[model samples]
Target chain A: SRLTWRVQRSQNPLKIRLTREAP
Target chain B: HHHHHHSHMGKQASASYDSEEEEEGLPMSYDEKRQLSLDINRLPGEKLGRVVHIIQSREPSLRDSNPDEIEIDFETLKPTTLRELERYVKSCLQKK
Candidate 1:
């Protein structure tokens, strides 16, 4: 399994974005 | 002979790992979101845009809604109070 994560700006300090891919 | 067992174990491990990652990226609860919004509002200058942007991002229903309406609700019509902003954000989040 593979995992990917992203953090982006929102009105708040941060917003979390996530994705997953099969190995 | 042991290929099936190995595959099953691998899937179980993957499932657990995925859940751990999910927890790390979990969205904030309603209360946390509201609290953070209020904290941001306390800052000087026009903040309704940022507030609406944050909530709209979290709650997609508001994304396509009228921006003017939101602005009127939170900024134009009322003083920028925490209670008012909180209510406005809540209403926007709950809007169907």
Candidate 2:
């Protein structure tokens, strides 16, 4: 469920960082 | 729930230093002299330091590619091409 939420949230560009390393 | 990275109950994920991407991954590199810290274990994670490498991929069409931008988590040693990136993403989503 954690990864699922992450993938779902990743659809949003703003939240993509949640699943990605910070720039 | 506390163990889950997505709990989002304590702090903004971005606010945590460990949650940030590594310095090597921040700047795109093109030469073997540049070592890639793409290994997930090398990245910084909240509380956990860095446990896993984060890889990202997108379509490679001209409309999809960013000439001004560089790929993320790309390894000069591994040398992953756009086609490889596409195939990797396709396979991953296909498994879902």
Candidate 3:
């Protein structure tokens, strides 16, 4: 199962991270 | 020999144009575009419709694309979204 994608801009360049939990 | 070389160059130019056109059809990946829209929508004084308009103008391929993929909570002010949109808008203006 797909969890969610997170976008982080805390750093100088923006970063997008994806996290998924075992179904 | 000169004519043959010119024709080959012309073919290469046309091939490059074709690849560029195909890329223009989808400037950014689906997830990236989705994030862009969501980031735009979260800006201060930014309305959902207005964000959609900006995105459509910049990337016409996403004109009729789905906006539901973006998760925006209108109830709260997302600072990160506003900052991202501001940066994006500045970069876009500089390109013009």
Candidate 4:
């Protein structure tokens, strides 16, 4: 059997913009 | 034609985003911030995206259905921590 899945991607180091906004 | 009888042609398993680790509670202040980066060439972009999404998408659920736990879709979220990043990669390749 073959296990297939979705594959998606990039350049340079990955830059994640994590944030949390509330009031 | 005659040949052996032993084969398959279908997906046997799939990778689930199971993140059962040091997850913390939400903040009552309703505010937070941070940035991280990683420099690796063996990193597969597509797999990485899935890893990020899975964590972001489910993380909020743990914090009282928080919608912005980690931005299910981030174009600037750099998974910095080596261990964290490595875990993410493993989650992506998690197959049975």
* Candidate number with greatest lDDT: 1
Tens-place lDDT digits, model 2, residues B1-96 = 356455456754554356654333332345421222222223333311111122322334421543222234333323343233334444544684
How well is each residue in A1-23 modelled by candidate 2, as lDDT tens digits? 12211111223222212232323
**lDDT scores of the candidates, listed in order:** 0.39, 0.30, 0.38, 0.38
TM-score of candidate 4 restricted to chain B?
0.24
Worst 10 residues of 1 chain B by lDDT: B71-80
Tell me the DockQ of each model, to 2 decimals. 0.02, 0.03, 0.04, 0.15
User: What DockQ does model 2 achieve?
Assistant: 0.03
Query: How big is the RMSD of model 1?
Result: 18.3
lDDT, residue A16, candidate 2: 19
Model 3 Cα shift for residue B76 (angstroms): 27
Per-model interface RMSD values are 12.5, 10.8, 10.6, 9.9
Off by over 4 Å in 3: A1-23, B1-46, B67-96
TM for candidate 4 is 0.24
Candidate 3 lDDT tens digits, B16-46: 3343422122233335444554454344333
Deviation in angstroms for B55 in model 1? 3.2
CAPRI tier of model 3: incorrect
Inter-residue clash pairs, candidate 1: none
Candidate 2 CA-lDDT value: 0.30
Model 4 lDDT at residue B76: 32
Model 1: lDDT to the true structure: 0.39
Which has the higher TM-score value, candidate number 2 or candidate number 4? Answer: 4
